[PDB]
Swiss-Prot record, chain A:
Its biological purpose: Component of the ubiquinol-cytochrome c oxidoreductase, a multisubunit transmembrane complex that is part of the mitochondrial electron transport chain which drives oxidative phosphorylation.
Organism, as annotated: Mus musculus
Spans within the Mitochondrial matrix topological domain: 1-41
Protein name: Cytochrome b-c1 complex subunit 8
Keyword field: Acetylation, Electron transport, Membrane, Mitochondrion, Mitochondrion inner membrane, Phosphoprotein, Respiratory chain, Transmembrane, Transmembrane helix, Transport
Record-level GO BP terms: cellular respiration; cerebellar Purkinje cell layer development; hippocampus development; hypothalamus development; midbrain development; mitochondrial electron transport, ubiquinol to cytochrome c; pons development; pyramidal neuron development
From Swiss-Prot, chain B:
Tissue: Expressed in neurons and astrocytes of the cerebral cortex and hippocampus (at protein level).
Gene ablation phenotype (knockout): Results in early embryonic lethality.
Biological role stated in the UniProt entry: Component of the ubiquinol-cytochrome c oxidoreductase, a multisubunit transmembrane complex that is part of the mitochondrial electron transport chain which drives oxidative phosphorylation.
Subcellular location: Mitochondrion inner membrane
Assembly description: Component of the ubiquinol-cytochrome c oxidoreductase (cytochrome b-c1 complex, complex III, CIII), a multisubunit enzyme composed of 11 subunits. The complex is composed of 3 respiratory subunits cytochrome b, cytochrome c1 and Rieske protein UQCRFS1, 2 core protein subunits UQCRC1/QCR1 and UQCRC2/QCR2, and 6 low-molecular weight protein subunits UQCRH/QCR6, UQCRB/QCR7, UQCRQ/QCR8, UQCR10/QCR9, UQCR11/QCR10 and subunit 9, the cleavage product of Rieske protein UQCRFS1.
Organism expressing this protein natively: Mus musculus (Mouse)
Transmembrane segments: none
Protein name: Cytochrome b-c1 complex subunit 1, mitochondrial
Protein family: Belongs to the peptidase M16 family. UQCRC1/QCR1 subfamily.
Length: 77, 160
């Protein structure tokens, strides 16, 4: 339940420093930009095609609604 | 038993917290490690860290004259008991000439001990303990041993 009897971990060594001794933003841009680009490249082909077909359906529906509100020139008489 | 003068050991025997603890002051050329080391069960590490940090900051803030003179008497007895014996006397001579460059007599040690009082103790403890980043070494079932953020947050108080 609490800390102490959660998991069984053996032979694992963890290394940590002080927050007051290490930087809060260590290479925030020079490493942040490639990481964000890599994450976007990894998960861009699962979200963008549904959102683009949403955009296409939205434009098609608005356009054909405007065309349905348009006057058909078949009723000249 | 429960009648031990030191509050950390009194709390340990009252709550059955630890198997053992000790305070150490290891010194090297203009550096050192000042702290404590405890052997305890996996279900009491957080409590021992909390109580040890509380005792450290009690010495930092409100150390009193009775425990100051108790610690002074303990230090006098420890120094003389260590310097009783030819082998520890020779060890002290060699180590003193290698580190200090001279053999400090027990009279000078006692003079420094008498110079130590309560205000000096809390000032030096606030200089070397209060709001300082520690070094933590855990081995074994140390899952309940708190992270560095909680250890540092115990290494200060919000009420001084």
């Amino acid at each position: 339940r609490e800390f102490g009897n959660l998991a069984r971990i053996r032979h694992v060594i963890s290394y940590s420093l002080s927050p007051f001794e290490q930087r809060a933003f260590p290479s925030y841009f020079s490493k942040g930009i490639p990481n964000v680009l890599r994450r976007t490249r990894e998960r861009i082909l699962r979200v963008a095609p549904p959102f683009v077909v949403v955009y296409l359906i939205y434009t098609w529906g608005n356009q054909e609604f405007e065309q349905s509100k348009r006057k058909n020139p078949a009723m000249y008489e | 038993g429960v009648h031990l003068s030191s509050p950390l050991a009194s709390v340990a025997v009252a709550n059955k917290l630890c198997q053992s603890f000790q305070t150490f002051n290891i010194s090297y050329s203009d550096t050192g490690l000042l702290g404590a080391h405890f052997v305890c069960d996996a279900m009491s590490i957080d409590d021992m860290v909390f109580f040890l940090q509380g005792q450290w900051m009690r010495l930092c803030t409100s150390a009193t004259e009775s425990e100051v003179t108790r610690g002074k008497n303990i230090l006098r007895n420890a120094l003389v008991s260590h310097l009783d014996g030819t082998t520890p006397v020779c060890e002290d001579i060699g180590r003193s000439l290698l580190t200090y460059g001279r053999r400090i007599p027990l009279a000078e040690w006692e003079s420094r001990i008498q110079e130590v009082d309560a205000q000096m103790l809390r000032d030096i403890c606030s200089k070397y303990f209060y709001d300082q980043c520690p070094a933590v070494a855990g081995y074994g079932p140390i899952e309940q041993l708190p992270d560095y953020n909680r250890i540092r947050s115990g290494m200060f108080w919000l009420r001084f």
